[PDB]
Amino acid sequence: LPDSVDWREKGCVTEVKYQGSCGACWAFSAVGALEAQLKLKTGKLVSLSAQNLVDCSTEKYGNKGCNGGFMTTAFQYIIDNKGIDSDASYPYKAMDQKCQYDSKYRAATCSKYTELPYGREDVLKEAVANKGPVSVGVDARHPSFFLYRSGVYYEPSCTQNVNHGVLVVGYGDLNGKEYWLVKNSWGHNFGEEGYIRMARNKGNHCGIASFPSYPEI
Ligand SMILES: *[C@@H](N)C1(NC(=O)[C@H](CS(=O)(=O)Cc2ccccc2)N[C@@H](c2ccc(O)cc2)C(F)(F)F)CC1
């Protein structure tokens, strides 16, 4: 496998989004993963509707909109629904709304998703290298996470109890420190312009490799 990967260099990553006070991290993680696939399949980079998932991938999928959800069930919703609208056609309002999906605004589809084996960082590396960006859950409950500004994030108090949905868009090493390149959804002002480099191959740090999954078109 290549020593480093950055899907932003292949134009497969849309710009960082800001979820606001709505717990839609899972929805942003899911669309971000599909956005890369759509780019690989059609050649067009398009932001997909996180709001679409918030309002429609609900109870039936075990999700609670602005109060949390799963990236995997979000993927299944897209498969079952036979589509997902573009962000432009179904804009993010940071609040729970009635489902307003309309196939005339469909911007992507999904045929299946894959959940990687628990905590295998090498397997995650392979997926990121050969498949594309991967949705993952990380433990982001620690004060240090919120205050992260640069370098490689390592928190002694992190655990494998994930609670925040994000997107791994690459990996590499910075000054002798291996890391996973993570796209967050707290706006471009968080970390390094919306991104955070988290410790890689450090005992599944913050549970980043605990529950990885990626969709396919
Ligand atoms: C992000 N804004 C938000 N967190 C979640 O929605 C969170 C994402 S996750 O990656 O931890 C989901 C996950 C957990 C365990 C194993 C694989 C994936 N999901 C939360 C959640 C899930 C389902 C419902 O119905 C509500 C909430 C939780 F509880 F799992 F962390 C809100 C902060």
Side-chain angles (χ1 to χ4, degrees), residues 125-140 142-152:
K125 180 184 176 183
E126 177 178 55
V128 174
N130 303 326
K131 302 296 183 175
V134 180
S135 295
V136 302
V138 302
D139 172 5
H142 312 287
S144 61
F145 189 93
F146 297 101
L147 287 170
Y148 169 87
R149 296 222 60 186
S150 70
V152 174

mmCIF file of all heavy atoms in Angstrom, residues 125-152, unseen atoms left out:
data_model
loop_
_atom_site.group_PDB
_atom_site.id
_atom_site.type_symbol
_atom_site.label_atom_id
_atom_site.label_comp_id
_atom_site.label_asym_id
_atom_site.label_seq_id
_atom_site.Cartn_x
_atom_site.Cartn_y
_atom_site.Cartn_z
ATOM 1 N N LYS A 125 -6.603 1.010 6.521
ATOM 2 C CA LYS A 125 -5.622 1.610 5.626
ATOM 3 C C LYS A 125 -5.841 1.091 4.204
ATOM 4 O O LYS A 125 -5.853 1.861 3.238
ATOM 5 C CB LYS A 125 -4.202 1.269 6.096
ATOM 6 C CG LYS A 125 -3.087 1.856 5.238
ATOM 7 C CD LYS A 125 -1.722 1.374 5.716
ATOM 8 C CE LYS A 125 -0.611 1.880 4.810
ATOM 9 N NZ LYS A 125 0.718 1.353 5.239
ATOM 10 N N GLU A 126 -6.034 -0.214 4.080
ATOM 11 C CA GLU A 126 -6.251 -0.809 2.771
ATOM 12 C C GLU A 126 -7.493 -0.234 2.093
ATOM 13 O O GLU A 126 -7.474 0.084 0.903
ATOM 14 C CB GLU A 126 -6.386 -2.326 2.892
ATOM 15 C CG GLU A 126 -6.681 -3.026 1.572
ATOM 16 C CD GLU A 126 -6.768 -4.530 1.729
ATOM 17 O OE1 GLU A 126 -7.573 -4.989 2.567
ATOM 18 O OE2 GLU A 126 -6.036 -5.251 1.018
ATOM 19 N N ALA A 127 -8.570 -0.096 2.859
ATOM 20 C CA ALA A 127 -9.820 0.437 2.335
ATOM 21 C C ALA A 127 -9.652 1.879 1.864
ATOM 22 O O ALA A 127 -10.095 2.245 0.769
ATOM 23 C CB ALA A 127 -10.903 0.359 3.404
ATOM 24 N N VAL A 128 -9.023 2.700 2.698
ATOM 25 C CA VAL A 128 -8.807 4.097 2.347
ATOM 26 C C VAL A 128 -7.960 4.195 1.077
ATOM 27 O O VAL A 128 -8.218 5.036 0.219
ATOM 28 C CB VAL A 128 -8.101 4.866 3.495
ATOM 29 C CG1 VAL A 128 -7.755 6.284 3.051
ATOM 30 C CG2 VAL A 128 -9.009 4.907 4.724
ATOM 31 N N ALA A 129 -6.968 3.319 0.951
ATOM 32 C CA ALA A 129 -6.081 3.328 -0.210
ATOM 33 C C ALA A 129 -6.729 2.810 -1.484
ATOM 34 O O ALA A 129 -6.596 3.417 -2.548
ATOM 35 C CB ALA A 129 -4.819 2.509 0.089
ATOM 36 N N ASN A 130 -7.448 1.699 -1.379
ATOM 37 C CA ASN A 130 -8.058 1.099 -2.559
ATOM 38 C C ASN A 130 -9.531 1.358 -2.829
ATOM 39 O O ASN A 130 -9.999 1.097 -3.932
ATOM 40 C CB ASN A 130 -7.835 -0.413 -2.549
ATOM 41 C CG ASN A 130 -6.370 -0.781 -2.478
ATOM 42 O OD1 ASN A 130 -5.519 -0.089 -3.035
ATOM 43 N ND2 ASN A 130 -6.069 -1.887 -1.806
ATOM 44 N N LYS A 131 -10.268 1.866 -1.848
ATOM 45 C CA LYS A 131 -11.698 2.100 -2.042
ATOM 46 C C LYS A 131 -12.084 3.578 -2.035
ATOM 47 O O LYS A 131 -12.847 4.037 -2.891
ATOM 48 C CB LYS A 131 -12.494 1.357 -0.963
ATOM 49 C CG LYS A 131 -12.260 -0.152 -0.928
ATOM 50 C CD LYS A 131 -12.722 -0.834 -2.213
ATOM 51 C CE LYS A 131 -12.554 -2.353 -2.129
ATOM 52 N NZ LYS A 131 -13.118 -3.032 -3.334
ATOM 53 N N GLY A 132 -11.557 4.318 -1.063
ATOM 54 C CA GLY A 132 -11.858 5.734 -0.961
ATOM 55 C C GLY A 132 -12.108 6.137 0.480
ATOM 56 O O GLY A 132 -11.876 5.340 1.387
ATOM 57 N N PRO A 133 -12.573 7.372 0.729
ATOM 58 C CA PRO A 133 -12.851 7.853 2.086
ATOM 59 C C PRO A 133 -13.767 6.891 2.842
ATOM 60 O O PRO A 133 -14.698 6.312 2.265
ATOM 61 C CB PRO A 133 -13.501 9.206 1.837
ATOM 62 C CG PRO A 133 -12.751 9.689 0.613
ATOM 63 C CD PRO A 133 -12.754 8.450 -0.259
ATOM 64 N N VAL A 134 -13.503 6.735 4.137
ATOM 65 C CA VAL A 134 -14.267 5.825 4.982
ATOM 66 C C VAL A 134 -14.916 6.494 6.189
ATOM 67 O O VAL A 134 -14.253 7.210 6.945
ATOM 68 C CB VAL A 134 -13.357 4.688 5.506
ATOM 69 C CG1 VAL A 134 -14.150 3.746 6.390
ATOM 70 C CG2 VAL A 134 -12.737 3.943 4.339
ATOM 71 N N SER A 135 -16.209 6.244 6.377
ATOM 72 C CA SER A 135 -16.921 6.809 7.513
ATOM 73 C C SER A 135 -16.477 6.045 8.754
ATOM 74 O O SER A 135 -16.327 4.819 8.718
ATOM 75 C CB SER A 135 -18.436 6.673 7.325
ATOM 76 O OG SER A 135 -18.896 7.446 6.226
ATOM 77 N N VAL A 136 -16.241 6.761 9.846
ATOM 78 C CA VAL A 136 -15.822 6.115 11.084
ATOM 79 C C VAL A 136 -16.368 6.848 12.292
ATOM 80 O O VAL A 136 -16.842 7.981 12.193
ATOM 81 C CB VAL A 136 -14.274 6.084 11.241
ATOM 82 C CG1 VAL A 136 -13.635 5.362 10.078
ATOM 83 C CG2 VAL A 136 -13.736 7.505 11.376
ATOM 84 N N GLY A 137 -16.293 6.188 13.440
ATOM 85 C CA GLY A 137 -16.735 6.806 14.670
ATOM 86 C C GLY A 137 -15.500 7.018 15.525
ATOM 87 O O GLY A 137 -14.613 6.171 15.548
ATOM 88 N N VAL A 138 -15.412 8.154 16.205
ATOM 89 C CA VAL A 138 -14.263 8.406 17.068
ATOM 90 C C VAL A 138 -14.760 8.933 18.399
ATOM 91 O O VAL A 138 -15.877 9.445 18.494
ATOM 92 C CB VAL A 138 -13.294 9.458 16.471
ATOM 93 C CG1 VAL A 138 -12.807 9.009 15.103
ATOM 94 C CG2 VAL A 138 -13.986 10.816 16.384
ATOM 95 N N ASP A 139 -13.936 8.783 19.429
ATOM 96 C CA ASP A 139 -14.287 9.286 20.750
ATOM 97 C C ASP A 139 -13.842 10.746 20.748
ATOM 98 O O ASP A 139 -12.648 11.034 20.819
ATOM 99 C CB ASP A 139 -13.540 8.508 21.835
ATOM 100 C CG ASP A 139 -13.717 9.114 23.215
ATOM 101 O OD1 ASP A 139 -14.501 10.082 23.345
ATOM 102 O OD2 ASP A 139 -13.075 8.622 24.169
ATOM 103 N N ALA A 140 -14.796 11.663 20.648
ATOM 104 C CA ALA A 140 -14.464 13.083 20.627
ATOM 105 C C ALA A 140 -15.034 13.831 21.837
ATOM 106 O O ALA A 140 -15.368 15.011 21.747
ATOM 107 C CB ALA A 140 -14.984 13.706 19.330
ATOM 108 N N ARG A 141 -15.120 13.143 22.970
ATOM 109 C CA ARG A 141 -15.671 13.709 24.193
ATOM 110 C C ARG A 141 -14.656 14.506 25.020
ATOM 111 O O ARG A 141 -15.035 15.244 25.928
ATOM 112 C CB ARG A 141 -16.273 12.592 25.047
ATOM 113 N N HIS A 142 -13.375 14.378 24.695
ATOM 114 C CA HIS A 142 -12.333 15.044 25.468
ATOM 115 C C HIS A 142 -12.021 16.482 25.056
ATOM 116 O O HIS A 142 -11.899 16.793 23.871
ATOM 117 C CB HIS A 142 -11.097 14.160 25.417
ATOM 118 C CG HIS A 142 -11.407 12.732 25.727
ATOM 119 N ND1 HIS A 142 -11.698 12.311 27.009
ATOM 120 C CD2 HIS A 142 -11.643 11.682 24.919
ATOM 121 C CE1 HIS A 142 -12.106 11.059 26.967
ATOM 122 N NE2 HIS A 142 -12.087 10.647 25.714
ATOM 123 N N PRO A 143 -11.878 17.383 26.049
ATOM 124 C CA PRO A 143 -11.583 18.805 25.845
ATOM 125 C C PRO A 143 -10.500 19.064 24.799
ATOM 126 O O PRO A 143 -10.600 20.010 24.015
ATOM 127 C CB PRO A 143 -11.163 19.268 27.239
ATOM 128 C CG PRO A 143 -12.044 18.443 28.126
ATOM 129 C CD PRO A 143 -11.913 17.066 27.488
ATOM 130 N N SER A 144 -9.469 18.224 24.793
ATOM 131 C CA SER A 144 -8.371 18.368 23.843
ATOM 132 C C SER A 144 -8.827 18.268 22.392
ATOM 133 O O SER A 144 -8.263 18.917 21.518
ATOM 134 C CB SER A 144 -7.294 17.311 24.108
ATOM 135 O OG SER A 144 -7.809 15.999 23.955
ATOM 136 N N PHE A 145 -9.845 17.458 22.124
ATOM 137 C CA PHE A 145 -10.324 17.314 20.750
ATOM 138 C C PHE A 145 -10.817 18.666 20.234
ATOM 139 O O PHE A 145 -10.379 19.150 19.186
ATOM 140 C CB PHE A 145 -11.453 16.276 20.688
ATOM 141 C CG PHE A 145 -11.859 15.896 19.286
ATOM 142 C CD1 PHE A 145 -11.281 14.800 18.653
ATOM 143 C CD2 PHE A 145 -12.795 16.652 18.586
ATOM 144 C CE1 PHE A 145 -11.621 14.465 17.345
ATOM 145 C CE2 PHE A 145 -13.146 16.325 17.274
ATOM 146 C CZ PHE A 145 -12.557 15.230 16.653
ATOM 147 N N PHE A 146 -11.724 19.270 20.993
ATOM 148 C CA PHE A 146 -12.315 20.560 20.646
ATOM 149 C C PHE A 146 -11.249 21.638 20.426
ATOM 150 O O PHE A 146 -11.389 22.507 19.563
ATOM 151 C CB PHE A 146 -13.255 21.008 21.772
ATOM 152 C CG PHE A 146 -14.430 20.084 22.001
ATOM 153 C CD1 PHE A 146 -14.433 19.165 23.053
ATOM 154 C CD2 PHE A 146 -15.542 20.145 21.169
ATOM 155 C CE1 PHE A 146 -15.539 18.326 23.262
ATOM 156 C CE2 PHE A 146 -16.639 19.318 21.374
ATOM 157 C CZ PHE A 146 -16.638 18.407 22.421
ATOM 158 N N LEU A 147 -10.181 21.571 21.211
ATOM 159 C CA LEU A 147 -9.106 22.552 21.145
ATOM 160 C C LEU A 147 -8.003 22.231 20.155
ATOM 161 O O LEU A 147 -7.039 22.983 20.036
ATOM 162 C CB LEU A 147 -8.500 22.747 22.543
ATOM 163 C CG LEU A 147 -9.342 23.524 23.560
ATOM 164 C CD1 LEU A 147 -8.726 23.415 24.956
ATOM 165 C CD2 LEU A 147 -9.413 24.984 23.120
ATOM 166 N N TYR A 148 -8.141 21.126 19.432
ATOM 167 C CA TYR A 148 -7.113 20.735 18.486
ATOM 168 C C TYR A 148 -6.854 21.783 17.414
ATOM 169 O O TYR A 148 -7.780 22.276 16.776
ATOM 170 C CB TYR A 148 -7.471 19.401 17.837
ATOM 171 C CG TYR A 148 -6.598 19.064 16.657
ATOM 172 C CD1 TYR A 148 -5.386 18.402 16.833
ATOM 173 C CD2 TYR A 148 -6.968 19.434 15.366
ATOM 174 C CE1 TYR A 148 -4.561 18.117 15.755
ATOM 175 C CE2 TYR A 148 -6.156 19.153 14.276
ATOM 176 C CZ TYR A 148 -4.952 18.494 14.476
ATOM 177 O OH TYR A 148 -4.142 18.199 13.405
ATOM 178 N N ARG A 149 -5.584 22.114 17.209
ATOM 179 C CA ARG A 149 -5.230 23.117 16.212
ATOM 180 C C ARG A 149 -4.297 22.598 15.122
ATOM 181 O O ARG A 149 -4.436 22.969 13.958
ATOM 182 C CB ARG A 149 -4.620 24.350 16.892
ATOM 183 C CG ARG A 149 -5.587 25.071 17.822
ATOM 184 C CD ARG A 149 -5.470 26.576 17.666
ATOM 185 N NE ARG A 149 -5.774 26.979 16.297
ATOM 186 C CZ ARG A 149 -5.647 28.216 15.829
ATOM 187 N NH1 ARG A 149 -5.217 29.190 16.622
ATOM 188 N NH2 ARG A 149 -5.950 28.479 14.563
ATOM 189 N N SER A 150 -3.347 21.740 15.479
ATOM 190 C CA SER A 150 -2.436 21.208 14.471
ATOM 191 C C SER A 150 -1.604 20.037 14.974
ATOM 192 O O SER A 150 -1.688 19.658 16.145
ATOM 193 C CB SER A 150 -1.503 22.314 13.957
ATOM 194 O OG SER A 150 -0.566 22.711 14.946
ATOM 195 N N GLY A 151 -0.802 19.469 14.077
ATOM 196 C CA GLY A 151 0.043 18.339 14.433
ATOM 197 C C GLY A 151 -0.734 17.036 14.406
ATOM 198 O O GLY A 151 -1.747 16.936 13.714
ATOM 199 N N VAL A 152 -0.261 16.033 15.143
ATOM 200 C CA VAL A 152 -0.940 14.741 15.203
ATOM 201 C C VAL A 152 -1.598 14.584 16.571
ATOM 202 O O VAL A 152 -0.921 14.554 17.599
ATOM 203 C CB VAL A 152 0.035 13.563 14.968
ATOM 204 C CG1 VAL A 152 -0.682 12.238 15.179
ATOM 205 C CG2 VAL A 152 0.588 13.626 13.556
#
